[PDB]
Design an enzyme around this catalytic site. Sequence first.
Site, PDB file in Angstrom:
ATOM      1  N   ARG A 125      10.741 -70.963  13.895  1.00 52.83           N
ATOM      2  CA  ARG A 125      10.771 -72.316  13.348  1.00 52.83           C
ATOM      3  C   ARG A 125       9.430 -73.016  13.571  1.00 52.83           C
ATOM      4  O   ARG A 125       9.316 -74.005  14.289  1.00 52.83           O
ATOM      5  CB  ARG A 125      11.921 -73.102  13.965  1.00 52.83           C
ATOM      6  CG  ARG A 125      12.013 -72.986  15.467  1.00 52.83           C
ATOM      7  CD  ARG A 125      12.689 -74.197  16.055  1.00 52.83           C
ATOM      8  NE  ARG A 125      12.481 -74.312  17.490  1.00 52.83           N
ATOM      9  CZ  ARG A 125      13.256 -75.023  18.297  1.00 52.83           C
ATOM     10  NH1 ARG A 125      14.310 -75.676  17.841  1.00 52.83           N
ATOM     11  NH2 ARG A 125      12.962 -75.083  19.591  1.00 52.83           N
ATOM     12  N   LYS A 158       7.338 -59.147  19.919  1.00 53.17           N
ATOM     13  CA  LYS A 158       7.162 -59.910  18.656  1.00 53.17           C
ATOM     14  C   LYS A 158       5.686 -60.214  18.401  1.00 53.17           C
ATOM     15  O   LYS A 158       4.927 -60.325  19.384  1.00 53.17           O
ATOM     16  CB  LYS A 158       7.946 -61.224  18.712  1.00 53.17           C
ATOM     17  CG  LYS A 158       7.434 -62.256  19.704  1.00 53.17           C
ATOM     18  CD  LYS A 158       8.190 -63.560  19.633  1.00 53.17           C
ATOM     19  CE  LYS A 158       8.125 -64.215  18.270  1.00 53.17           C
ATOM     20  NZ  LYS A 158       6.741 -64.601  17.912  1.00 53.17           N
ATOM     21  N   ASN A 160      14.057 -87.634  -2.105  1.00 54.73           N
ATOM     22  CA  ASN A 160      13.349 -88.908  -1.988  1.00 54.73           C
ATOM     23  C   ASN A 160      14.343 -89.944  -1.480  1.00 54.73           C
ATOM     24  O   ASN A 160      14.883 -90.738  -2.249  1.00 54.73           O
ATOM     25  CB  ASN A 160      12.741 -89.315  -3.320  1.00 54.73           C
ATOM     26  CG  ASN A 160      13.729 -89.217  -4.463  1.00 54.73           C
ATOM     27  OD1 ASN A 160      14.515 -88.275  -4.541  1.00 54.73           O
ATOM     28  ND2 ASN A 160      13.703 -90.201  -5.350  1.00 54.73           N
ATOM     29  N   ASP A 168       2.584 -62.723  17.386  1.00 58.05           N
ATOM     30  CA  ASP A 168       2.409 -64.185  17.591  1.00 58.05           C
ATOM     31  C   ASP A 168       2.697 -64.897  16.266  1.00 58.05           C
ATOM     32  O   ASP A 168       2.514 -64.266  15.207  1.00 58.05           O
ATOM     33  CB  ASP A 168       1.039 -64.510  18.190  1.00 58.05           C
ATOM     34  CG  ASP A 168       1.128 -65.555  19.285  1.00 58.05           C
ATOM     35  OD1 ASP A 168       0.831 -65.210  20.445  1.00 58.05           O
ATOM     36  OD2 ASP A 168       1.502 -66.702  18.970  1.00 58.05           O
ATOM     37  N   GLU A 169       3.123 -66.158  16.322  1.00 54.75           N
ATOM     38  CA  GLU A 169       3.516 -66.873  15.113  1.00 54.75           C
ATOM     39  C   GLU A 169       2.377 -66.962  14.105  1.00 54.75           C
ATOM     40  O   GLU A 169       2.623 -66.972  12.896  1.00 54.75           O
ATOM     41  CB  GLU A 169       4.017 -68.273  15.467  1.00 54.75           C
ATOM     42  CG  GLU A 169       3.079 -69.062  16.359  1.00 54.75           C
ATOM     43  CD  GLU A 169       3.594 -69.190  17.778  1.00 54.75           C
ATOM     44  OE1 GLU A 169       4.389 -68.326  18.208  1.00 54.75           O
ATOM     45  OE2 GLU A 169       3.202 -70.155  18.466  1.00 54.75           O
ATOM     46  N   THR A 221       6.386 -62.012  23.804  1.00 55.44           N
ATOM     47  CA  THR A 221       5.374 -62.296  22.754  1.00 55.44           C
ATOM     48  C   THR A 221       4.059 -61.660  23.206  1.00 55.44           C
ATOM     49  O   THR A 221       3.542 -62.077  24.258  1.00 55.44           O
ATOM     50  CB  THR A 221       5.216 -63.801  22.514  1.00 55.44           C
ATOM     51  OG1 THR A 221       6.509 -64.355  22.267  1.00 55.44           O
ATOM     52  CG2 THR A 221       4.292 -64.117  21.358  1.00 55.44           C
ATOM     53  N   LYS A 253      -2.793 -64.329  22.297  1.00 57.40           N
ATOM     54  CA  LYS A 253      -2.260 -64.735  20.971  1.00 57.40           C
ATOM     55  C   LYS A 253      -3.057 -64.054  19.853  1.00 57.40           C
ATOM     56  O   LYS A 253      -2.418 -63.465  18.962  1.00 57.40           O
ATOM     57  CB  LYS A 253      -2.340 -66.254  20.807  1.00 57.40           C
ATOM     58  CG  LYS A 253      -1.644 -67.073  21.884  1.00 57.40           C
ATOM     59  CD  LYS A 253      -0.597 -68.006  21.320  1.00 57.40           C
ATOM     60  CE  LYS A 253      -1.078 -68.756  20.096  1.00 57.40           C
ATOM     61  NZ  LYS A 253       0.016 -69.526  19.459  1.00 57.40           N
ATOM     62  N   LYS A 306       0.566 -60.955  24.268  1.00 60.84           N
ATOM     63  CA  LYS A 306      -0.517 -61.923  24.581  1.00 60.84           C
ATOM     64  C   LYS A 306      -1.748 -61.149  25.068  1.00 60.84           C
ATOM     65  O   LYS A 306      -1.578 -60.285  25.948  1.00 60.84           O
ATOM     66  CB  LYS A 306      -0.013 -62.911  25.639  1.00 60.84           C
ATOM     67  CG  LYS A 306      -0.920 -64.099  25.927  1.00 60.84           C
ATOM     68  CD  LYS A 306      -0.338 -65.061  26.937  1.00 60.84           C
ATOM     69  CE  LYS A 306      -1.248 -66.235  27.229  1.00 60.84           C
ATOM     70  NZ  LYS A 306      -0.624 -67.189  28.175  1.00 60.84           N
ATOM     71  N   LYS A 321      12.541 -75.664  32.552  1.00 58.98           N
ATOM     72  CA  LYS A 321      13.981 -75.339  32.366  1.00 58.98           C
ATOM     73  C   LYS A 321      14.306 -75.521  30.879  1.00 58.98           C
ATOM     74  O   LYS A 321      13.428 -76.020  30.150  1.00 58.98           O
ATOM     75  CB  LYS A 321      14.863 -76.232  33.245  1.00 58.98           C
ATOM     76  CG  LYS A 321      15.263 -75.625  34.583  1.00 58.98           C
ATOM     77  CD  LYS A 321      15.925 -74.272  34.438  1.00 58.98           C
ATOM     78  CE  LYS A 321      16.438 -73.719  35.751  1.00 58.98           C
ATOM     79  NZ  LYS A 321      17.469 -74.598  36.351  1.00 58.98           N
ATOM     80  N   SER A 373      13.019 -69.268  24.003  1.00 54.07           N
ATOM     81  CA  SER A 373      11.700 -68.702  24.381  1.00 54.07           C
ATOM     82  C   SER A 373      10.984 -69.617  25.373  1.00 54.07           C
ATOM     83  O   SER A 373      11.552 -70.662  25.730  1.00 54.07           O
ATOM     84  CB  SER A 373      10.848 -68.491  23.158  1.00 54.07           C
ATOM     85  OG  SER A 373      11.598 -67.890  22.114  1.00 54.07           O
ATOM     86  N   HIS A 384      14.727 -68.789  16.594  1.00 55.03           N
ATOM     87  CA  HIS A 384      14.157 -69.422  17.772  1.00 55.03           C
ATOM     88  C   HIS A 384      14.717 -70.831  17.893  1.00 55.03           C
ATOM     89  O   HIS A 384      14.457 -71.682  17.042  1.00 55.03           O
ATOM     90  CB  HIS A 384      12.633 -69.433  17.679  1.00 55.03           C
ATOM     91  CG  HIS A 384      11.959 -70.100  18.834  1.00 55.03           C
ATOM     92  ND1 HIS A 384      10.728 -70.707  18.725  1.00 55.03           N
ATOM     93  CD2 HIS A 384      12.343 -70.255  20.122  1.00 55.03           C
ATOM     94  CE1 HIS A 384      10.383 -71.212  19.895  1.00 55.03           C
ATOM     95  NE2 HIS A 384      11.346 -70.951  20.760  1.00 55.03           N
TER      96      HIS A 384
END
Lengths: 133, 133, 420, 420
Positions: free
Chosen positions: D255, D161, D83, D163-164, D133, D137, D135, D294, D339, D287
Amino acid sequence: QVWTPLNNKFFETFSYLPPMTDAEISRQVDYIVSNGWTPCLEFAGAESAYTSNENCVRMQNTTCLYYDNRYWTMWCTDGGQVLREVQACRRAFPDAYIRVVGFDPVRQVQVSGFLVNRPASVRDYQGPSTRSV
Amino acid sequence: QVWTPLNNKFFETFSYLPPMTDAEISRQVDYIVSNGWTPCLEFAGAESAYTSNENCVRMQNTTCLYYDNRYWTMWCTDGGQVLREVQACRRAFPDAYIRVVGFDPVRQVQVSGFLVNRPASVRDYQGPSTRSV
Amino acid sequence: LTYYTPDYQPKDTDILAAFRMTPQPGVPPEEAGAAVAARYKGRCYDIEPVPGEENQYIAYIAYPLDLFEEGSVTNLFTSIVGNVFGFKALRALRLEDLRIPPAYVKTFQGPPHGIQVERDKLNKYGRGLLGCTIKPKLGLSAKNYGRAVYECLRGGLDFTKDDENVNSQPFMRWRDRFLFVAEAIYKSQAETGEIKGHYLNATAATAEEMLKRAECAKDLGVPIIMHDYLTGGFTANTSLAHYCRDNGLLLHIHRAMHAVIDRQRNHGIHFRVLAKALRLSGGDHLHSGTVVGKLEGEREVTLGFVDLMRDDYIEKDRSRGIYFTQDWVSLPGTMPVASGGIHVWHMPALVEIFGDDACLQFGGGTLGHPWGNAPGAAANRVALEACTQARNEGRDLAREGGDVIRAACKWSPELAAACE
Amino acid sequence: LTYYTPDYQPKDTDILAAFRMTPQPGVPPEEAGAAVAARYKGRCYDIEPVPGEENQYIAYIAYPLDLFEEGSVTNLFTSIVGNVFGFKALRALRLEDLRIPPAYVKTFQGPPHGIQVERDKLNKYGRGLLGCTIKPKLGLSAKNYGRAVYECLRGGLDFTKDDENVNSQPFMRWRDRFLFVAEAIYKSQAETGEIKGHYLNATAATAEEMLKRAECAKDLGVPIIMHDYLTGGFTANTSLAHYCRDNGLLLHIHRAMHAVIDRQRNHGIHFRVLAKALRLSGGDHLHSGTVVGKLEGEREVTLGFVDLMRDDYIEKDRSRGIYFTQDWVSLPGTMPVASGGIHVWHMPALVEIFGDDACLQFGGGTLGHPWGNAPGAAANRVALEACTQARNEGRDLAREGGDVIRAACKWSPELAAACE
């Protein structure tokens, strides 16, 4: 075109480029030497070149991150000497894949590992143009 | 020179010496007999001569200290009789490795075990000069 | 003196200790022996002066069997040498020998397998075993450690071992090392066709962690592990030995911190007592000597404790330091491991001194062979086999070791580069 | 002010925080730093104004080591930023950096394996790793997910991987996906001969369910799993990292929900602190950036947190956002994962910026290659290897990336259809 799944084996680093010439191997070894690392040579015949699960039969609990044939057999000042050793290994074991390895002498860890020889006798691999059919 | 990892199998005791002649085998058997031990002959073909993990597929918990082909097949007064039996085993099974074993009759334990024959037909082993390339 | 009873005849179940003590001037030897001795009372039944040393006596103490906990080396050491080295009346005190009665011996499991079961499991007969200590000592990654293990084992060595101080460090965690060493062991086994092994260090901070490392070794199917019993403790060692017996694992024992207790002649506990405590607690191998230049220490003393840790029945022999007849009532024997600078031309001497029931360890890491680790291992194996063959033929190794080495070198290119 | 001590010299065991704070008008910076600071009291020992921003100061706070629980990222974040972002006296507050003393670092396990152990286990050296990843998703069945995984991995990719947001849904339950992905991984391994892997998402509602998914991955023998640490929590992450160390599993960290805390320059916690918290808690991959067009974000800031999450010793560098020298005392490093839209001609730039110790992720799912998933993966692998080879030869990638790509395309039919 279709990536061929027949006789298309690969050996990690620089394996997807065309076979490296003597000058290219020499330049790679010079790069390894420049960084302060030690180059050496690994070799294996076709029977112990690819990863396998032959010894997983002896294990319980888990086999995660265990693979056979990760280790090859060991065969170091500059590119010319390593090239001479590459020719010597080729003559001694013509049916064996040769791999150049790099070792950081301070961290005592392997830092490099690229194939430099594919036995003409063995046909488990394709060529840059025969990789797609 | 580089220890060859190709067709360089070995069979424990006295396997790294050059192949023993009849006189040398006879002297070894005489040594076994002198100590009060019993000599016998073991033999195995190339398919069951080297250690293997073929039966580990049937086991759980652990496979520690378990290896297949540790046992060979059994084929005893002095060196001459054991030599005659060695020739008899050679004639009967020309493609089989022969091993001389010793047994202490009091402790009832195996005390000796050295290879005395390598089948010319089989080429899974090297020679004293071809062990390094 | 109620505790000095020179007419007492020790019972068949008494635990006997032979103390070499130097009392302070003015203290008679009888009084000092009475103090060390002091139905459940320890008693001094015999005192002999040491011929050759001034004011030096050997005091023989008899302890009743009821004094100790069954199968507990920890309790035995607590009772015998718990608080007796701190007596002011003694200038110096040294425990020389122990007599473990069969009644006590039967309460111990002993070594998990022993020498004969080890030979049967490994299928190696008629020759000593060979081992190497992976070098450099520290800093090597698990991958590079495994590479060194595979290179040394493929040459013809029967064993490799982790360094004594290699347990689990930021540079090389223990599970990575176990996995890479398992891969190396299996590769070398497939290549040579002989059963191979590596002394995996299970020595850890907590018994739980040590048992977890032993469990990982059991799950990999690898043959053998290692333990530091004098630093880990007898309680931890006994747990590991019971586990190894239960799960069919061999157990190599390293005697770290031994010289802190068995080096000085006047004070401490002689290594033979530590070797007997190890055999009781459990261990298939026990690092028993160093070969710096040559086997160090009096040969007779070495032979004495080697026989004490190997044979089933050792008669009293004061020449070799055996103060009591030791009956082992069929307890499995422990294989002595002689380590250090075992040079090729020094193999005949050690083969003659130890025989076949020993492991010669190249703790220097070899590397002296100009060709590599594997040919150096082969040279060593060739030399050992040639010496064994010569000894079996009736040759006198102590007189013809050089001739045997040369004759073996005449046909062995690997030994030729080693003999130079 | 009892809590502002400009003459205080921070101890070697203090935890140091660098807060970028904008106090309300009328509040002096010393008073605001004293408030944030307020034997176990946190103290403001240094305040520097920000040159370029009005009423902006960097406040350095020193916390005693006794304040925190050993090996607990949860407690560290509770103590430092529990806090303090709700203070009315501060218009805006932003934690920029932390100094974790070695004494605290040693209480953490850290990443399960690290970069070097990962390279040794996967037997891949001298080049960056590649991932995709799968796809679309969501909506894909476990069978079709596995088919896509196999097609992408057989092309030459080292990883795929989940998907998140793919954890366990009516359309694709987690165990079906794990089984089909395991079959695909093993098929691709057999076909190519290289070790392959797939970041299996273990993120779950309860720690028990997450550990069950990790256990299934361990029972399949697959190499690596994935976790969302900022949504699952540090407590769940630390449990998973301990499990992965115990059972030899790699751990990729995503993340999710990071921009909710590290996007605004005036408020929140900078990603570098979250990266250091992840390295402490445990993760082999993290990640670390997006490559839309870019690599986005200041290069120096990216390089700073990449070095902070990779190297063992990072000296203070305010140019790259390092407010404190960070000694990691041999804690394993975390591999950064870049990524996003990694196009083929943009590979030289990322290879130059990151080097070999990074994973380039094609989170767009590739599919831009007209031939298929497998040739697209091959084109990417060919481009990465060609760029690495050119860099090893002494070429300047930032100036000759197009030339290297063209030269590789001259002999690669797969890259020819990708370079167009």
